[PDB]
Protein: Transmembrane emp24 domain-containing protein 10
Organism: Rattus norvegicus
Amino acid sequence: GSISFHLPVNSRKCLREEIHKDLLVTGAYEITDQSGGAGGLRTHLKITDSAGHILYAKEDATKGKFAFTTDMFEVCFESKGTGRIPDQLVILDMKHG
């Protein structure tokens, strides 16, 4: 799977997956910010199961990879900043084994 989306400042967008099978899930993401971190802009990535256990987390996420096994989970991106900042562009690619 592949998703591209804009992430406004101080907002959160999540992808929720409910596949009732045991899986190896791998992913790669890139968060792009034209402003160079204006207004203290930062983005956190958090992957959680349906009971809120953290399967993966990255504070101050930029570009990277993740992996975890399961069975329902959510991949969330959340930015924090002050002032008027253009939306960030985020790409997320995942595959399921």
Q: What stands out?
A: The longest strand covers residues 24-32. Residues 1-97 form one domain.
